[PDB]
Amino acid sequence: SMSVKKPKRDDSKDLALCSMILTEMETHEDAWPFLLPVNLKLVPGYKKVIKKPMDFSTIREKLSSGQYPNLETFALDVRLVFDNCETFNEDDSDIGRAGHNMRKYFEKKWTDTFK
Ligand SMILES: CC(=O)Nc1ccc(C(=O)O)cc1
Structure with missing residues (x-):
């Protein structure tokens, strides 16, 4: 509250660390469904x-x-990618499987880097 500060995270390295995580996701071999926006003109529904x-x-x-104002807004967008993937794709599809794999991959990097 007013004039009562909690000690808080050193967040000065967050930008660099999120960039590193994003790079690792970009270069994962199952990243291909997620590298570019889905073509809204060519994909029905x-x-x-x-x-x-x-x-x-x-x-x-x-x-x-x-x-991104902070590292949590970054994580929300990453999770949005995989949440969207689950909404639109069957778990058994290649894209569906790719999504589950990438989510698992991301969350471990997230935990190991910040938690
Ligand atoms: C990210 C994502 O789900 N993209 C796509 C793109 C195209 C298809 C399809 O043509 O079936 C399915 C899913």
Whole structure:
């Protein structure tokens, strides 16, 4: 409260660390469904069903241009990618499997880097 501060995280390295994590996701061999935005013109149903599309290149642009206020808003966008993937794809599809794999991969990096 007013004039009563908790000790808080050293967050000075967060930008560099999120960038490193994003690089590792960009270079994962199962990253191919998530590298670019889904083509809303050519993929039936996607525009109407998926209210907030998100992909790695869009996250990269936002990270490079100061559009994440903190590391949690960054993690929300990464999770959005995989949440969207689960909404639109069968768990047994290649893309569905890719999504589950990448989520697991991300969350371990996240825990190991910040928790
Ligand atoms: C990220 C993502 O789900 N993208 C896509 C793209 C295209 C298809 C399809 O054509 O079936 C399915 C899923």
